[PDB]
Amino acid sequence: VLLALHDRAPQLKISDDRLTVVGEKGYSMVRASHGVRKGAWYFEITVDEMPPDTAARLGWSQPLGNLQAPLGYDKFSYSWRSKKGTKFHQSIGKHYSSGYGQGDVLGFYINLPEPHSEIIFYKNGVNQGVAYKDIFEGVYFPAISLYKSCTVSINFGPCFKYPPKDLTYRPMSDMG
Amino acid sequence: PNYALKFTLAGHTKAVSSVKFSPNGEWLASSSADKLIKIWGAYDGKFEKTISGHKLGISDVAWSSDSNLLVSASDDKTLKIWDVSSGKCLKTLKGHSNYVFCCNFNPQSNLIVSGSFDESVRIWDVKTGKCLKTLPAHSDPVSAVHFNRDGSLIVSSSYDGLCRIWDTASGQCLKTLIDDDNPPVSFVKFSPNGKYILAATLDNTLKLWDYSKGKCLKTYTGHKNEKYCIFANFSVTGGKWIVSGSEDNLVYIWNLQTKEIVQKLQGHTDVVISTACHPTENIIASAALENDKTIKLWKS
Amino acid sequence: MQIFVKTLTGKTITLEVEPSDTIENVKAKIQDKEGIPPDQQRLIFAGKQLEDGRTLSDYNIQKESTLHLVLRLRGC
Amino acid sequence: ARAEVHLRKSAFDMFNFLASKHRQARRATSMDLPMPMRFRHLKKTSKEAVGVYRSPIHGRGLFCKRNIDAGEMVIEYAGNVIRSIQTDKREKYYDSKGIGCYMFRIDDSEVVDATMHGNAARFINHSCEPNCYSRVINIDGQKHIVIFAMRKIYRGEELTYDYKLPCNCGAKKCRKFLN
Amino acid sequence: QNYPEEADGTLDCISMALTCTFNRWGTLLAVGCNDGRIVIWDFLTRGIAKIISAHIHPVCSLCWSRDGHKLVSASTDNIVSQWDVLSGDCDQRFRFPSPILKVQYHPRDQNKVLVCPMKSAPVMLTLSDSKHVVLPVDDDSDLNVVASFDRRGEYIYTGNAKGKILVLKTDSQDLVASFRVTTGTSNTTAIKSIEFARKGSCFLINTADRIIRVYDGREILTCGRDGEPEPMQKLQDLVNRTPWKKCCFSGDGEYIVAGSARQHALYIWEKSIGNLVKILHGTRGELLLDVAWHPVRPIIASISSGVVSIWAQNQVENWSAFAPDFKELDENVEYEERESEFEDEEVDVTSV
Amino acid sequence: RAKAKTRSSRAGLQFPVGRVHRLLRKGNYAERVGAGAPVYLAAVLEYLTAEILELAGNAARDNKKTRIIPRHLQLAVRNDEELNKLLGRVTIAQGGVLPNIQSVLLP
Ligand SMILES: Nc1ncnc2c1ncn2[C@@H]1O[C@H](CSCC[C@H](N)C(=O)O)[C@@H](O)[C@H]1O
Ligand SMILES: [Zn+2]
Structure with a gap:
């Protein structure tokens, strides 16, 4: 699936294969043009490079968030810190969960029927923490907010490499 | 910790401002607000004279290292250098446009610092009485100024919670210690070696800031x-006691080894604003405000 | 003939030379063993400046004696 | 005098720069040269061009010491190159700290902070008949913020510009609402 | 910082200054004058500390003791007195041959003073009584000898007007080490003054062919008697040719200052590399008298026509000593601050 | 018979010392030419050359160029005060002028 062009921060290294993103200095949260509304949709975040001192905030942020927003600023955006899992949300400090290794396959999922949510930190089909509860209906963009130039890819194929176990979803060849 | 009353210096007819010991440790001086600076002894309170010749009131009185020369922080916006052995107006020196609260000498006794109310912290001359330097320091009346042991540093306390260490030779600011609260910082002074500063703030808490x-x-x-x-003062003769005056008719003396209520003296009838410690002996002065007008000599 | 050279710092070199060797050979041996350049090897024999173009059978040098290497400084 | 315990003991101010004194072509920045020829000489000139003193208008202000000519450069507004959402945290933060806003945006992407880091281009007051303005120029890819002039300015006159709430400007063309 | 650069005022308080010296810590400055007056300043307070009337005839030599409480001088009247800084009274006084050059305490003991008369031999004295030991001179023909103690106090270096340096042991007069200075091709040159550092073994010889030679204090002890050492560093001026007047070392013995006897300038070299680093000019038509150096801080005190100048680094200040939470930058700096955007120690306070 | 070291390297310069000494000997200035005179004069010529090329390279950088043409030498000389007093009666070819319009001519 192709990325966006004008609803984003162009100073990042949207690399020249149109399928791989590289970050820069600062949490300039680039967000894709395929935000969830209803049904069931999932993709992966495939790490091909992760140097040290590279915190990678991953989550789901609304169109109401800033293009330069920290992922974890408000009620409209979650967070998951690499240092002791200490997530920050509505300016709340809670030492909560664990970290994440190098070169793994990431990817988060939410289930919003036409509601009741399934918001758990999804890593490799393994529980990493029940995050939050009872959001409102709306749009949530794929949030890529990196600290350094860690080259990570992204999988848009229906043949996922680490999906959640027993997931009800739809193939990604219908959004773009 | 066995201090008992010995004598009582009486004769001051207003609120007693401050009492200080001579550097040789033999002459506890005294003053008041009634334009009368008396000269008393140390071991019995023996009368010598009463220094005056002014036009308006008197705040404070400083010393000389040989226990001879004096200056008065008078309240006619002038600087009158005095003397113990004669009692003569040696140098009549103007310089400020408001009153003066604190004034001190460097240990080599050639400069006069004067933290005033018109906020021009000046450095005066002793031999000729000429203005020498000027420091645009504060936006508040300066409460305390002090030199260190050698004489290369000047400290300054204010009302807005600021303390700045000033240079003697060049004369610019070097270190500013910051406080989130802003009480009127009342009386700072150096350590007796010259490597620590004890700060007194108005939140009923003293603080000992490390210098460097x-x-x-x-x-x-x-x-x-x-x-x-x-x-406030220090004690080096016996224990590490810290002598200060009191508002609730007491004498505030405690220890940083204790950090708790271990000793209180009692007997005053007004707010003791100024205490003084003796360099070689265990002699503690305590002078109160207008409802007492007496001085209680404590002695171990 | 193993004579010695002690400097002013307190270090003594152990040179297992022959009684008929040259100076630049000693310079090359010191370049091999120490890495110190030979641009300062002014040896002192009874206060006299030993010339650099000499041998050991010239100054009537006693065996297992003590010479002295004094460092010099130049370079801008 | 040791007894009259009075008010006016705290002011809650960062700068105690309000002093007792408050004593308020040929050059390359005034020539018609291209822009990086002027921008290089700018920072060497701005140390002797202007200064900060006690302004009668509102707090402190920028006061020249030398005759600025017409249409030349005066000083650069330079501080932290932050992005436009840390500005919200700092607005609420110094709302809790009571410190005012020093936030010029270069464009609709990033904002220059002048609270923790900056130079003497903070202390320029607001007015309605000003004598200075601003542009955004290009020096080797990066962008900068230069405060120009509008007419010949005499030694002692205060520099002001339009920032774009009751104000103490007092000018005849006042608006009385600065938003 | 390092070696001074800017002119920085003067001390135009008492006229007709002639010579100057510092103590070990550099807090006092004794200066003799043209009528027997010794004025002491301060550098901790930048003010005059004490003025003591000495004599009626001028003073041409001064030396501080090790404790700092005793001075000694050598006026025109052949007077060598152990003065006081508290009372200020002459104690000892007895006449010499009428020109006297230099006096100097022993660097460890305030009992031994080394007086160098002009037309005589060096005389080592005592101060517990009136003993005097005339030191031996090799040539005994010219009688123009300068001498000084070394740094620690173990030896005394002596020099004649023929370029023959001798080493005498400080108490038993043991002529153990000697050399003749290799001046050009064949001719010998005079010796004007000998000075020693404050840290180490190096020293300098001021000859009369206008070249300053920097030796090492251990090569002489290595070479022994009648050896031939060569200098570590040869320093001169060849444009103006500059006959020198006075030399001394820096604080830790790293730099060398050398005042001029013709043009009123001060030249500063390095000791390690050996290159000229700065020339400090001044008033164009004066005449130079003395050069000093502050032992822990870069201050030079040059006397010229009674005016003492002080080259003292030109302190220029800034902000951020007033507001410590602020950093006054110069150009733009981009960053974000953090990657996550939101004991009983009793120390003696009266220890000196 | 030793290794030859040119007199420029012995003084730490870049201009030649031997060529300056020859041009003083073969130029009818005096009979005898001292030893330190070409070293002094080559040091002075190197200082003035570096002093003008600094400013010319700065102007060439500010015009978004890599090389130096005579316009940048013109701007560098005419903007400095003391280089302008030294090169006062000198025409530099292909140089142009400085922008200067009088005050009473523009509306
Ligand atoms: N001319 C003016 N009249 C009233 N308020 C002004 C003003 N110019 C600036 N201000 C206010 O003051 C702030 C600028 S900072 C003012 C100068 C300096 N900080 C000082 O007082 O010492 C802004 O928040 C603005 O709201
Ligand atoms: Zn207004």
Whole structure:
């Protein structure tokens, strides 16, 4: 699936294969043009490079968030810190969960029927923490907010490499 | 910790401002607000004279290292250099446009610092009485100024919670220690070696800031100091006691080894604003405000 | 003939030379063993400046004696 | 005098720069040269061009010491190159700290902070008949913020510009609402 | 910082200054004058500390003691007195041959003073009584000898007007080490003054062919008697040719200052590399008298026509000593601050 | 018979010392030419050359160029005060002028 062009921060290294993103200095949260509304949709975040001192905030942020927003600023955006899992949300400090290794396959999922949510930190089909509860209906963009130039890819194929176990979803060849 | 009353210096007819010991440790001086600076002894309170010749009131009186020369922080916006052995107006020196509260000498006795109310902290001359330097320091009346042991540093306390260390030779600011609270900082002074500064703030808590690093070490609790500007001292003869005046008709003496209520003296009838410690002996002065007008000599 | 050279710092070199060797050979051996450049090897024999173009059978040098290497400084 | 315990003991101010004194072509920045020829000489000139003193208008202000000519450069507004959402945290933060806003945006992407880091281009007051303005120029890819002039400015006159709430400007063309 | 650069005022308080010296810590400055007056300043307070009337005839030599409480001088009247800084009274006084050059305490003991008369031999004295030991001179023909103690106090270096340096042991007069200075091709040159550092073994010889030679204090002890050492560093001026007047070392013995006897300038070299680093000019038509150096801080005190100048680094200040939470930058700096956007120690306070 | 070291390297310069000494000997200035005179004069010529090329390279950088043409030498000389007093009666070819319009001519 192709990325966006004008609803984003162009100073990042949207690399020249149109399928791989590289970050820069600062949490300039680039967000894709395929935000969830209803049904069931999932993709992966495939790490091909992760140097040290590279915190990678991953989550789901609304169109109401800033293009330069920290992922974890408000009620409209979650967070998951690499240092002791200490997530920050509505300016709340809670030492909560664990970290994440190098070169793994990431990817988060939410289930919003036409509601009741399934918001758990999804890593490799393994529980990493029940995050939050009872959001409102709306749009949530794929949030890529990196600290350094860690080259990570992204999988848009229906043949996922680490999906959640027993997931009800739809193939990604219908959004773009 | 066995201090008992010996004598009582009486004769001051207004609120007693401050009493200080001579540097040789033989002459506890005295003053008041009635334009009368008396000269008393140390071991019995023996009368010598009463220094005057002014036009308006008197705040404070400084010393000389040989216990001879004096200056008066008068309240006619002037600087009158005095003398113990004669009692003569040696140098009549103007220089300020408001009153003066604190004034001190460097240990080599050639400069006069004068933290005033028109906020021009000046450095005067002793031999000729000429103005020498000028420091645009504060936006508040300066409460305390002090030199270190050698004489290369000047400290300054204010009302907005600021302390700045000033240079003697060049004369610019070097270190500013910051506080989130802003009480009127009443009386700062150096350590007796010249490597620490003891700060007195108006939140009923004293603080001992380390000089070069820039953080505090230990505090004091259990004293009453909210309205006025109460002095403090050090003790090197016996224990590590810290002598200060009191508002609730007491004498505030405690130890940083204790950090708790371990000794209180009692007997005053007004707010003791100024205490003084003796360099070689265990002699403690304590002078109160207008409802007492007496001085209680404590002695171990 | 193993004579010695002690400097002013307190270090003594152990040179297992022959009684008929040259100076630049000693310079090359010191370049091999120490890494110190030979641009300062002014040896002192009874206060006299030993000339650099000499041998050991010239100054009537006693065996297992002590010479002295004094460092010099130049370079801008 | 040791007894009259009075008010006016705290002011809650960062700068105690309000002093007792408050004593308020040929050059390359005034020539018609291209822009990086002027921008290089700018920072060497701005140390002797202007200064900060006690302004009668509102707090402190920028006061020249030398005759600025017409249409030349005066000083650069330079501080932290932050992005436009840390500005919200700092607005609420110094709302809790009571410190005012020093936030010029270069464009609709990033904002220059002048609270923790900056130079003497903070202390320029607001007015309605000003004598200075601003542009955004290009020096080797990066962008900068230069305060120009509008007419010949005499030694002692205060420099002001339009920032774009009751104000103490007092000018005849006042608006009385600065938003 | 390092070696001074800017002119920085003067001390135009008492006229007709002639010579100057510092103590070990550099807090006092004794200066003799043209009528027997010794004025002491301060550098901790930048003010005059004490003025003591000495004599009626001028003073041409001064030396501080090790404790700092005793001075000694050598006026025109052949007077060598152990003065006081507290009372200020002459104690000892006895006449010499009428020109006297230099006096100097022993660097460890305030009992031994080394007086160098002009037309005589060096005389080592005592101060517990009136003993005097006339030191031996090799040539005994010219009688123009300068001498001084070394740094620690173990030896005394002596020099004649023929370029023959001798080493005498400080108490038993043991002529153990000697050399003749290799001046050009064949001719020998005079010796004007000998000075020693404050840290180490190096020293300098001021000859009369206008070249300053920097030796090492251990090569002489290595070479022994009648050896031939060569200098570590040869320093001169060849444009103006500059006959020198006075030399001394820096604080830790790293730099060398050398005042001029013709043009009123001061030249500063390095000792390690050996290159000229700065020339400090001044008033164009004066005449130079003395050069000093502050032992822990870069201050030079040059006397010229009674005016003492002080080259003292030109302190220029800034902000951020007033507001410590602020950093006054110069150009733009981009960053974000953090990657996550939201004991009983009893120390002696009266220890000196 | 030793290794030859040119007199420029012995003084730490970049201009030649031997060529300056020859041009003083073969130029009818005096009979005898001292030893330190070409070293002094080559040091002075190197200082003035570096002093003008600094400013010319700065102007060439500010015009978004890599090389130096005579316009940048013109701007560098005419903007400095003391280089302008030294090169006062000198025409530099292909140089142009400085922008200067009088005050009473523009509306
Ligand atoms: N001319 C003016 N009249 C009233 N308020 C002004 C003003 N110019 C600036 N201000 C206010 O003051 C702030 C600028 S900072 C003012 C100068 C300096 N900080 C000082 O007082 O010492 C802004 O928040 C603005 O709201
Ligand atoms: Zn207004």
